[PDB]
RNA sequence: GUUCUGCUUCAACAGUGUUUGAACGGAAC
């Protein structure tokens, strides 16, 4: 029973069936001071309290965040949903399919087996035949399981849009309202925190654990509050703001922490801006950068097609539980761990040049700075030209017209794509500037080499939907060697001509031999300098050009404010962008409960995990006279345990593949074979860099002690299982460190390994092993292989008691009479339960077949 | 000797990207 059910009440009395956990009633004093990001964790634990996977001390720990943040305590995080990128969800769907077969064979309803939460299979990357089977398998899954949706290949290939498309922000499901939140096997997951949705990327195994009902374990984080106030000056672009906030966070030191935004300034950042910041958190090391749901967010939901009524209810919910943000109201502000601040008036627009991308010069100083460079002695910021020559200039004819070319004249104005994701808005800004310039009679001298290659992507929507290309075209910028006259005037006058470039994508690549000076600036600034034809200008007190009719026009007259840009964005660009997606998804899923495993397949196979699984729990079996399969040292990485990349031709995996009619050229990678336990098991400990102490040298092998033969690890393990010998692995410190490897636990399980004895375990991996039924043993403080004399050739016996207690001590008796203690590393009752059930998957099977 | 090319590794930052570079792995002759 949920001890906090008394908090559940109807959001709207006219709808008794739709409830929400009123966190306000839990403890208003501490709740109202909590960072909004932490509130999402809180609500999640509270609604899922089950006195087991999520205990009430857990809810207490989160609620007491202000204090606990400093005691490094583990709390559970139960996401509202999961995202499985590309084909990373194959092993997971295979487990669930195999789990259904398992429940069938026990006389139960297979359909009782299903992912606890919604899962979105996002296969949006852009050999198609190489993935056909795996694609097919996941498609079957989307139909066989509930709440399992799929974004197929050949539809939305603009990731960002797909993620926001899948963002609920607030769930209205099974009679409850709760905040949207997730974890995905997609590194870009953190991007969605810009829209108020808490979440980040995790390992494949952790994602599956979520699908199995297991919370992500995590240290209650500190929360750096980043405040935004003031207004930015006129020429300041989104990228300027983003890079400032981004670069700052890096220095502040937020690695391992949460970053939550606030201050009246947040109201000035569009969802696109927020998403860009959140998405770059890997760069500054934060776990997540959260932007509470405010009116901007809500309005964004409408812009994407969600309907008014639903959205209105979402806001009502957020206001009721106290998770709706009003950045203008300081009284609402949380009690952050630390506060960093940024006055937008502080950001200063700049250009880089005239020779190095590192040499920054404020836009308002371009004139002075350039004129100083003319004098200065030939340096990175000097061309040295006889003081009299400064005001030089020659003339020339171009297309039956005359033009003068003074020093600092602009001959090239090229706009290219930026890698930074806030570029789209900035490009739109460049366009809106064009429109206003054209409307004001301005133009760009014909001889100026002007180009525009925005690249592909989201920017396309921003240009097209805003109907700005016509104007950009009129000024010489159309979607994609200077005139002979110009090159002559430059050289004949021995002039320092200028090139203006937007986009960081390669600098020295287009530095014309004729452009002695070159600057990097924002897209709109490029166009501007092209209208002005020179950088020796002071935009504050100098016309961009005299109206083809009467008066003069100033830069300030045609430069779009961030608000104007955001207005065009929200009423034309975003709506269009998402309409196209609902469609590309709808019409593509149209061309279409137990899995019919194909024996001829080499990509999908039913795992052995549940052979002879009995509905009743049998008492734990001791490990008797086991043999050590591998005697390892320190820092054995997950990639050593389960390698990534291609398959060696001299491997158990290769032989297996050969024996089935496959040639080397068609083996593919271990990664691609994750849905076939046969190949993955054969790849366990197949890393050529493996350093087995039994051999004192890098080799994917071990000694089959009975024979003394040295075979590839899998092979030795096979033999051992045939002979009926239990197996265990010895290891040094930090066992299982390294990046996520889907089979780092399952592989060892299929090699017959019943236990591991290490000096130290990397947190996650230890958990992964428990999950698969494997026993993690740890030497007592101070002891290890050498201390104890262990050679790895003795036969090990470990007698497990039926009354196991967390971190209990057990004896290990060798067949040489020797004896010693070790810690059986099951850290919690949940973990003990998985052990008794033989693993988390097995536990799930029993809980369902009733 | 030539050519083609990952649940990889490492590095860089006009600036974090379906980025750039390098390494290793893999395939073919």
Swiss-Prot record:
Keyword Cytoplasm: yes
NCBIfam families to which the protein is assigned, alphabetical: aconitase_1, PRK09277.1, PRK12881.1
One GO CC annotation: cytosol
Reactions listed under catalytic activity: citrate = D-threo-isocitrate
Residues holding substrate: 85, 186-188, 505, 510, 660, 740-741
Gene3D superfamilies: 6.10.190.10, Aconitase, domain 3 (3.30.499.10), Aconitase, domain 4 (3.20.19.10)
Gene from which this protein is expressed: ACO1
Highest taxon of the lineage: Eukaryota
Protein name stated in the entry: Cytoplasmic aconitate hydratase
Keywords: 4Fe-4S, Cytoplasm, Iron, Iron-sulfur, Lyase, Metal-binding, RNA-binding, Tricarboxylic acid cycle
Cofactor section: [4Fe-4S] cluster
PROSITE patterns in alphabetical order: ACONITASE_1, ACONITASE_2
Amino-acid positions noted as binding [4Fe-4S] cluster in the UniProt annotation, renumbered to this chain: 418
Native species: Oryctolagus cuniculus
Cofactor descriptive note: Binds 1 [4Fe-4S] cluster per subunit.
């Amino acid at each position: 029973s949920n001890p906090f059910a008394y908090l559940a009440e109807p959001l709207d009395p006219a709808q008794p069936g739709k409830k929400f956990f009123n966190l306000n009633k839990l403890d208003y004093s501490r709740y109202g001071r909590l960072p909004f990001s932490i509130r999402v964790l809180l609500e999640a634990a509270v609604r899922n309290c089950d006195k087991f996977l999520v205990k009430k001390e857990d809810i207490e720990n989160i609620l007491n965040w202000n204090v606990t943040q400093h005691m490094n305590i583990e709390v559970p995080f139960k996401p509202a949903r999961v995202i499985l990128q590309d084909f990373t969800g194959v092993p997971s769907v295979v487990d669930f399919a195999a789990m259904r077969d398992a429940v069938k064979k026990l006389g139960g309803d297979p359909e009782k087996i299903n992912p606890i939460c919604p899962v979105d299979l996002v296969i949006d990357h852009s050999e198609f035949e190489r993935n056909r089977e795996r694609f097919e398998f996941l498609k079957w899954g989307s139909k066989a399981f509930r709440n399992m949706r799929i974004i197929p290949p050949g539809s939305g290939i603009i990731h960002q849009v797909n993620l926001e498309y899948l963002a609920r922000v607030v769930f209205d499901q099974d009679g409850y309202y709760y905040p949207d939140s997730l974890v995905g096997t997609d590194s870009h997951t953190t991007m969605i925190d810009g829209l108020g949705v808490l979440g980040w990327g995790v390992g494949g195994i952790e994602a599956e654990a979520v699908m199995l009902g297991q919370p992500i374990s995590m240290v209650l984080p500190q929360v750096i509050g980043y405040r935004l106030m003031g207004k930015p000056h006129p020429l300041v672009t989104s990228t300027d703001i983003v890079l400032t906030i981004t670069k700052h966070l890096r220095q502040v030191g937020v690695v391992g922490k949460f970053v939550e935004f606030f201050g009246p300034g947040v109201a000035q950042l569009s969802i696109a801006d927020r998403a860009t910041i959140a998405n770059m958190c890997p760069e500054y090391g934060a776990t997540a950068t959260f932007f509470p749901v405010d009116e901007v967010s809500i309005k964004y939901l409408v812009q994407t097609g969600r309907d008014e009524s639903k959205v209105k209810q979402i806001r009502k919910y957020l206001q009721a539980v106290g998770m709706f943000r009003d950045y203008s109201d300081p009284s609402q502000d949380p009690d952050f761990t630390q506060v960093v601040e940024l006055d937008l008036k502080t950001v200063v627009p700049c250009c880089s040049g005239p020779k190095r991308p590192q040499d920054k010069v404020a836009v308002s100083d371009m004139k002075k700075d350039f004129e100083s460079c003319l004098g200065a002695k030939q340096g990175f910021k000097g061309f040295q030209v006889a003081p009299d020559h400064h005001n030089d200039h020659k003339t020339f004819i171009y297309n039956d017209s005359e033009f003068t070319l003074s020093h600092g004249s602009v001959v090239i104005a090229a706009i290219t794509s930026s890698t930074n994701t806030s570029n789209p808005s900035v490009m739109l800004g460049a366009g809106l500037l064009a429109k206003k310039a054209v409307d004001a009679g301005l133009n760009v001298k014909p001889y100026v080499k002007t180009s525009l290659s925005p690249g592909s992507g989201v920017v396309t929507y921003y240009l097209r939907e805003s109907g700005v290309m016509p104007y950009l075209s009129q000024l010489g910028f159309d979607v994609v060697p200077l005139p002979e006259p110009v090159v002559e005037a430059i050289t004949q006058g021995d002039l320092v001509a200028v090139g203006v470039l937007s986009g960081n994508r390669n600098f020295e690549g287009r530095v014309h031999p004729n452009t002695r000076a070159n600057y990097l600036a924002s897209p709109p600034l490029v166009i501007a300098y092209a209208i002005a034809g020179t950088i020796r200008i002071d935009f504050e007190k100098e016309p961009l050009g005299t109206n083809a009719k009467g008066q003069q026009v100033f830069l300030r007259d045609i430069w779009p404010t961030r608000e104007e840009i955001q207005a065009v964005e929200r009423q034309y660009v975003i709506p269009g962008m998402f309409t196209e997606v609902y469609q590309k998804i709808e019409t593509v899923n149209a061309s279409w409960k137990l899995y019919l495993w194909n024996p001829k397949s080499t990509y999908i196979k039913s795992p052995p995990f549940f052979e002879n699984l009995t509905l009743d729990l049998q008492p734990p079996k001791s490990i008797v006279d086991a043999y050590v399969l591998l005697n390892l040292g320190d820092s054995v990485t997950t990639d050593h345990i389960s390698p990534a990349g291609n398959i060696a031709r001299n491997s158990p995996a290769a032989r297996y593949l050969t024996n089935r009619g496959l040639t080397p050229r068609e083996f593919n990678s271990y990664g691609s074979r994750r849905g076939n336990d046969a190949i993955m098991a054969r790849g366990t400990f197949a890393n050529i860099r493996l350093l087995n102490r039994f051999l004192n040298k890098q080799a994917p092998q071990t000694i089959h002690l009975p024979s003394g033969e040295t075979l590839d690890v899998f092979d030795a393990a096979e033999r051992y299982q045939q002979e009926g010998h239990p197996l265990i692995v010895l290891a040094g410190k930090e066992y299982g460190s390294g990046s996520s490897r889907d089979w780092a636990a399952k592989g060892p399980f299929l090699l017959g390994i019943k236990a591991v004895l290490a000096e130290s375990y990397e947190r996650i991996h230890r958990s992964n092993l428990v999950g698969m039924g494997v026993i993690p043993l740890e030497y007592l403080p101070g002891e290890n292989a050498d201390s104890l004399g262990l050679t790895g050739r003795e036969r090990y016996t470990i007698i497990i008691p039926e009354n196991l207690t967390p971190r209990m001590h057990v004896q290990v008796k060798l067949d040489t009479g020797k004896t010693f203690q070790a810690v059986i590393r099951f850290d919690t009752d949940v973990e003990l339960t998985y052990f008794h059930n033989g693993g988390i998957l097995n536990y799930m099977i029993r809980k369902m077949a009733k």
